[model samples]
Target: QEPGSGIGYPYDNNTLPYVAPGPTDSRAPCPALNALANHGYIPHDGRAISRETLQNAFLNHMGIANSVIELALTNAFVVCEYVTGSDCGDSLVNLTLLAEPHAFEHDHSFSRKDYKQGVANSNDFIDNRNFDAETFQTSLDVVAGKTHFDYADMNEIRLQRESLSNELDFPGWFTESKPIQNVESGFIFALVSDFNLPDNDENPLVRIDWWKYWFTNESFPYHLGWHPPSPAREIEFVTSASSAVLAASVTSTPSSLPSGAIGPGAEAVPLSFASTMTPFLLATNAPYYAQDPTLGPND
Candidate 1:
């Protein structure tokens, strides 16, 4: 059955209706079907309508999911506020597609775009892009401040605190993970500004309030250094560009020791099964997991 056309609910009879790709796809009716098709299934391989192609093509463009699209705008807003210190939310209404990538391809810009795409593709919006260079850098400072909590400091503090508490016999203190404050997307109506129509320069569905969306309270653990610092030293943490806490490690070493032995006469240690498995595990798992999960219990 065909419905009548309206402003928001416009549907054209001339266009083909969404169809079930196959019996397998029927198990779950969602964007997943389109994602599978566009990611390299039969009909969607080259179809412009496929989720993959559309997502990639329109990644920076608006008209994707409303929540994700708005979040991307908010990220851009944070940059403007941090850099220019001006309330540029209104400027977002005028934001039209540069038609291509921005003039300077900063890693943050790429991160922003990729984060938006991730949100569009996945349901976890807050978690994605929460651990960028900014957060990583900030985390460094936080960890550095924990100098007093190093193994030595920890031992001293524990003893001191225990002794004091034992006299008072205080029940259960310092059991909580330390609270770290940061900014992140909020469902707050103020955070998510009203949707605006695109200006003449952009697609109609393109809408955002780039300003006033700054300041989120979200951060994620990022790596800064590998191998715990010396007993006397503290682990160094880095923060993301926005000064968000990150637990990133700057150094990394191969998990396994090199194959050669200590002396010339020593025999080379053959690669173990675990070493062999490491390479296989490192290989992309998509192809192996690509079997359609929609195909019923047997599949």
Candidate 2:
């Protein structure tokens, strides 16, 4: 049983019946989390989710590792506290709380649109909740002939978005958690495609349209035999898959970087061929986490 070979499914709840969020249910900017909520894997309300609940949902439902979960949880608290300047210590986090940009969410997202740019207090603007078709088509157009995507293929989209951000002077581009978007895209590939593939590309069983279906509808691809990743999205596979994606990108390369861009701590990356790797991949960024956590990677 391999990834595209249709190897494993986590649990029956993986294909659990779907119920659209009521007007009252809080929805996140993340398609995966929203789909989880929509399917009742997580609370349909999407509010006041505790670490334990999320850990259970992601661990049992999505097979995501605790390491990834811990990072995201920690970062969620940090971003919340940073934005609101209030106590986030040991408090519950809702999906809605995570939509705040520059934490896990970001600008120039693969599918989501950037918040209004080059404007005063732009960060204060609400993130668009739905998938932007034009943004996705922009990504699709990058590798126009391909029906599926991998880290390398997806990197085209990543580099383009980062380049666009540079053109528009995405505010605080270096300071923001923009790199996390690559991390999440890696996860999306791990979830939707066969991670076992040497290139870590999308599974033939899981078509490009499936990606759109999930992202657009904010629901699992039930009819297409989608399931909770069975081997579980373990730390090694997740990180390596993401690394392959990041390693292939030129966005972090000095030549592609806008002026004044530097690695976290400034001392982390020395700005050379060795520095071409993104801070997210560099061992240096350990302090930033020595500072945050992961999920919904966005703009």
Candidate 3:
């Protein structure tokens, strides 16, 4: 794939033109996939998307490197699932199927609110599949006047968002979804830069306008000077970007967080879990972990 030259596809206002999905069209919490559906790259209905078709969408439309697409394919199969009469969704997946939270989709996403269970009240989970206009607005406000988003701006908004996260939401926000959050934090910027900006030690910026178009409107910002990267955004570049973002990251402490909510995000998750269970002294006697070391092979 040539730099700036899209993956050999005619991606203009014509040819495969962009069409918004109908109201009942199946969709997921993923903006990228949703955008692809809107653009007709994959099925505009967002149904029956196979692994091969998805890989093509990422490669042809998004210009994602082969390795990354392969990695995503593996993760998609392993993590994303649906239940028909049984837990057999591993055989197939659809856009709607991706909405299973803590799976492919997760809580505290940048573009949507967490489910009710993660909030002060309510336990509904419908919001997990919809993009909230209000949430996207908060992110836009952070870069109100910026022309583009760079490395620091990435973590800058990240830490800022964490602080702004609601008290009850903060624990699950920080914990419960580590590797996904880590990869996604990289993606928040990489989606803009991966196939768009150069990989460098300095700051590789993503055009803010394009970024808004992708999230705010769920479309590719082709007309906004958005072009594929000169070099494919390979594992080296992506991992480099992920490493840099995580390096710049420090754990967040929610302001006025309730005493019960205090501590690093991970600590809070486990702490909360352990709170309801038996004490360590008592828990040690549970059948799962208990039994004399010498008799471990009693089975």
Candidate 4:
């Protein structure tokens, strides 16, 4: 007979002594068990107990479904990854932020009381949309001219300093305490017009694609106040490189660097003098690569 199968017959039930059945036979594994087994979260090959499996078992026995159990586990994993400097973790955290609202509600097996408590707990979780606005405001405050580094004036030496100030005039004088009324539209406007001045001021073209890339695709180890080059500059670079390689020879254009060659309103500078300053310019331009002590490719 199968391990769980049992049968009994009694001829004289009236005179028979009451006998309790032996320990219940082990049952076949269910989908939840299989999921654990597949993920190696459960014990196999008579190995030592897995703490994860043990904890999962504890939770399962406490009437929690595997789905909800793994939700927590997955969230923990994402948090761990985030702290460990994984880029994917950012998106995972953002995704989890969106899903957290429905996390407990998704599990229908939860009691009404449990559902209410779970919902309350979930509500405490971060809301990405709200976070995005808050973060944008905070970041805007930093970019719109916050003092990054400061040195006190001492008797021995007085340090010269230059500070950035917001040039664009909005409806109100924007301050740290007061952000824009409409955060979403204001954020886009700030990025395109105020933060990084577009080539065409009257009708500036802001690429939402690039804006999304900056806001979302790029993850932490975040550098503040760094904006991508204008679309015009990007196009110029490509065009110049192509023109230089195909049309002009290596030894060609021995004169001074042309106006608007590399940057907007750039005047002609002697090639030798420019070559001498390349190291300084490269270090100042590429903040990411500035950490290296050695001279960069631009040198």
Best by TM-score: 3
What does candidate 2's lDDT look like per residue over 113-151, in tens digits?
Answer: 555444456444434444566777776677677656666
Per-candidate TM equals 0.17, 0.70, 0.70, 0.17
lDDT, candidate 4, 181-255, per-residue tens: 112122233232222444433333333333332333221001232232222122233223222222222221222
Quantify all predictions' global Cα lDDT against the true fold.
Answer: 0.21, 0.55, 0.53, 0.23
TM-score of 4: 0.17
lDDT of 2: 0.55
Off by over 4 Å in 4: 1-123, 127-184, 192-199, 219-299
How many clashes in each candidate?
A: 37, 10, 1, 0
Enumerate residue pairs that collide in model 2: 71-293, 71-294, 72-293, 72-294, 75-293, 106-298, 106-299, 107-299, 287-290, 288-291
* Tens-digit lDDT string for candidate 3 (1-299): 22234423454212244565565676767788877776667787877667777776776677566766565556455443322222324343456655655545555566666553355434333365666667767666766787876655565555444444444463444334434554665555555753433443246676677776667656665656565443445656666665565456434433633233321222101111112332111001101111132111101
* TM-score quality measure for candidate 2: 0.70
lDDT of 3 at 243: 57
Judged by lDDT relative to the true structure, which candidate is superior, 2 or 3? 2
Q: What is candidate 1's lDDT per residue for 1-299, written digit by digit as tens?
A: 11222111221122121222333221111122232332232243212232233333222111223332233344434433333334455342111111111111111121122112223233222211121334333322322433211222212222222232223222321121111111111111112222232331111110121211111111000011111111211111111211211121213222222122111111111111222221111111111112222221111
Winner on lDDT between 1 and 3 is 3
The per-residue C-alpha lDDT of model 1 at residue 75 equals 41
Candidate 3 vs. true structure, TM-score: 0.70
Alpha-carbon RMSD of each model: 23.2, 10.6, 14.7, 28.9
